[PDB]
Design a protein around this ligand. Sequence first.
Ligand code: HEM
Ligand code: HEM
Lengths: 441, 441
Amino acid sequence: KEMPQPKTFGELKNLPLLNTDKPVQALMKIADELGEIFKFEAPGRVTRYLSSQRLIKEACDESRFDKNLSQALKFVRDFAGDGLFTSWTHEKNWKKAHNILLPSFSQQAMKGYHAMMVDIAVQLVQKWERLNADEHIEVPEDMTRLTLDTIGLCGFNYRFNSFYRDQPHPFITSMVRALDEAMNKLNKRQFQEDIKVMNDLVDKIIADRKASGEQSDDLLTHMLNGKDPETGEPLDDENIRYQIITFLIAGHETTSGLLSFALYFLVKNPHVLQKAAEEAARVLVDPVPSYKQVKQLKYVGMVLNEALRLWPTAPAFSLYAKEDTVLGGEYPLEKGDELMVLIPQLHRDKTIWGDDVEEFRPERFENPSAIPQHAFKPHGNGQRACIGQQFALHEATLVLGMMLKHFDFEDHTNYELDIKETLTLKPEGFVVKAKSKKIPL
Amino acid sequence: KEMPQPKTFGELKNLPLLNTDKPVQALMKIADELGEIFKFEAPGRVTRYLSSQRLIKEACDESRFDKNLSQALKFVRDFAGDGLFTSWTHEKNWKKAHNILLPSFSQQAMKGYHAMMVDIAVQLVQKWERLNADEHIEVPEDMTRLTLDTIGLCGFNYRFNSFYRDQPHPFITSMVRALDEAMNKLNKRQFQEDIKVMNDLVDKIIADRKASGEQSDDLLTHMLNGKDPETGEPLDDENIRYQIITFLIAGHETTSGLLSFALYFLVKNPHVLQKAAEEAARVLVDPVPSYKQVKQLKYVGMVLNEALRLWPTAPAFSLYAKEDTVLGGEYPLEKGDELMVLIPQLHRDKTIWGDDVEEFRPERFENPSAIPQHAFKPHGNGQRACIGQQFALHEATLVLGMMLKHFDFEDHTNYELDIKETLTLKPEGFVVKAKSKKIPL
Ligand code: HEM
Ligand code: HEM
C-alpha cells in the first residue's frame, strides 16, 4: 500500500537524481532496487514509475488512463505544435489528423513508400561499398542520415542529400539543435531562429506543392487530399507543417537507434548474425529488394523486436488518471495523477520473459501470439501508440536485410556499449568495419 | 475508372464463377483478387460488390443511396409483407413502424425484456445440465431453439416450447419451410399453406389480446398501444402481424448463428475461452443474471463483436443509387444502379484492421470509440440498420455469459468449420460436449 520512493534532497525532492546524463538508466537502477512502482517527486510535480507488466497492463486501460503531455513533450510542442505527438487526445486537431493519417501509415500503405525507402537504403549501402580498406563506419551517424532522408522523401518528397555532405542540410542542423535545446531545458535567440528555419522550409514546400498541383507518393499528398470522416474537414496548412516536422522529430532517432542497437547486438552475437545473414541471402534474391521480400525477412524482424525489447529507443511515456482509481488493488490514484511507463524495465519483467532477460535472443519472438498483452510496448499504447510503427519496422527490416546481404561486419574496436540519452536512446560511438561480399546492388 | 470485373464467358457472363451454394464465400475470394470493388454480371442482372471501408463509407451516405429490396427480400416479402425488413424506405408503413417501434428496441427497453430472456436462457442451461455423460450438443440447433423462443416470448408473449420438442411448433415448421422456399426460389401449394399457418396463428393472438385488454412486457403490447408521433396514426392489425413474423425471420438465425460462431471461436481458442469464462465467473454472482450484470460482461461483448467481424451472420445488404452520382471519384453510377456491401470482406480491410484479419482477437474491440466510422457494420446502415441490434446483443451476451459460467466445453470431434449460407450464415453441424461446473441456478 505504501509506495517506495528513492532518496530526497530536501525541497529539491528527487530532482537531483536525474541531474545526470543518463536519467533513464539511473531510473532503471532505482526500479531495480525499489521494484515495480515508486514515487518520483520534483518541486512542482509528482509521478509514479511503473516497471511490471502487472501494473502497466492496467495503466494501458484507455477507459482509465490517457496520454499525458510530459514536460519534455511540452517543450517539443514549441516547434512540433499540435501535430499528433504533442497533442492532447481531446484536442480537435489530434482526432482530425489521427483519423485522416491512420490508413496512410498502415502496413498496406508501406507498399507505396517502399520505392523511396529503397532509394535511400541503396544510397547507404553504396556508401559502404565505396569505403576503402583503411576506413570504418560510424553506425548511428549513418543510420541517422538514412532515417532523416527517408522520412524527408516519404514525408514530403524532399531530398536532404545527407550522403552528399559533411555538414547536414540547414533544416536538419536547425531541427537537431532545436530538439537538443528542448531536452536540455528539462539559446532562446537561436531556438527562435531554428524554429523559423524549420517552418520556413516546410511552409514553402507546402505552398510549392499546392501551386503545382502535383500528386506524389508522399504523406504530404495524402494530407492535402485528405478529409476527416467525422467533421469532413481537411487539415489546414499550418497543422500539415507541424505533422511533417513531427514525423521527422518522432521518427528519425528512434528508428536509427533501433538499427544501431540491432547491428550492435548482431556483432556481439555472431551465431545470431549468421542466421540473420543466411535469411537475407535466401530471401533478397534481387539487386533491389521488393516490398514482398521485406515481408519474408521474418528472423530479421525478430532481431529488430528483440533489440527493441532490450533498448526501446523512446523508453518512457506518460499517462494521467482519467478518474479516481486504484492501481493493482493497492495504490489509490486521484484524477489527473501521472504515471510513467519505464519500458526497458517492463521488457525485463522476469515473470513474463523468463530469467534470462539480459540475453539477446530473437527466438523469443518466434511466436508473436505467445507474448501476453501489454508485455512488449516499444511503440507505446492504444490509440496514442506510434502511428509510424509499420513505417519504422518496414524501413529497419529493409535496411538491416540489405546490410546483411551485402557485407560481413567486424567489431574491430571491441566496442563497449555506451548509451547516450536525449529524447531517445542510442549506442554512442558504435563503429564497425564492413567487408563487401561483392553482390550486385 | 473502368470497374474491375471477373472474366465473362459468352452469354453466361460471370455466372460460371458462382457454381456454389456458398456465394458470399466465393465472392470474398473474387474480392481478394480484384480488390475493393467489382462488377458481377449474370444473364438476368448486374451488381457491384464493395469491400473496402473507404467506398462503403460513401455507399452509407443516405442522401445518395438507399436500401434496395433484393430478389431474396422480395421473395421473403410474400410472407413478411410490409414489415420493417422487407419494405422500401419510401413506404408509409416503413416510416410509421420505424417511428413507433424504435423506442421499444432501445438499450433502455432491454430492461423490460430481460426477465423473459432469462426464462428461455435458463431452459437452455437446464437442458444441458440434464444431458447424460456420453451425450453431446447440437449448437446451432439449440441456439435457434433459444432465439426463436425468446423472440416469440418477448415479441408476443407466445411460447413455442422448443425445448419440449423434437419437431418444432407448427408455426416454426411453416415459417422455416417458407423461408427455405423463398431462398430456393433464387412447392407453391405448401408455400401457400405455410403462409396461412403463419397468418392464422399471429392474427389469432392479436385478436385474443385486444379481446382481453391484457397488457404484457412484449412488443405486441407496444404495437397495440403506440401511435406514430409524425402522423399520429397507429399500426393496423395486418401490419402488426407482419412485424411479428418479421422479428422472427430477421432475428432468429442471425442471432443463433452469432452464438454458434462465438462458441466455435472460443473452443478453437482455449485461452480466449478461459479469459471469457473468468469474466463470466467474476460478474455473474447471482443464481440468475441481472440486467446490470449482463452490461458488465465487457469481454463477452468483445468476443461477440469479434465473431461478428469475421462471420457477420447477415453477410450482405443491397443499396441503390438514389440519383446519378460518382462513387469514390472514379466510378459513375446511374439512378437505380445496385451496390452490394460484402460485409465479411469489409471486416477484412487490412488498411483498417491490420494485416492479421483472419485471427480471432476480441481485444480489437477493447476501445470501441477507437474503431473507424463505418468499419464495422454487422447490423447494416443508418435508418435501415438492424432495429433488433440491442436485443440481439443483450440476448447473446446474456446466454454466452451463462454458458461460460455453468459449463466447460470440449470440441470432441475437432469440428471442421462448414459455413452454410441461406439468408444467414451458420457453422453447420457444429457439435460440442459440455461438462457442467455444477453451479446451481
Ligand atoms: C523504432 C522506431 C520508433 C519508436 C521506438 C517509436 C516510439 C514511439 C512511442 C513510444 C510513441 C508514444 C509516445 C507517447 O506515448 O507519448 C510514439 C508516438 C508517435 N510516433 Fe513513433 N516511434 C518510432 C518511429 C516513428 C516513425 C518512423 C514515425 C513517423 C514516420 C513516428 C511517429 C510517431 C507519431 C506521429 C507519434 C504520435 C501518434 C499519436 O499519438 O497519434 N514514430 N512513437
Ligand atoms: C446478431 C444478430 C443480428 C444481425 C447480425 C442482424 C443484422 C441485420 C442487418 C444487416 C440488417 C439490414 C438488412 C438490409 O440492409 O437489408 C437487419 C435489419 C433488420 N433486423 Fe436485424 N440482425 C440481427 C438481429 C435482429 C433481431 C434480434 C431482430 C428482431 C428482434 C432483428 C430485426 C431486424 C429488422 C426488423 C430489420 C429491419 C429494420 C428496418 O429496416 O427498419 N434483427 N438486421
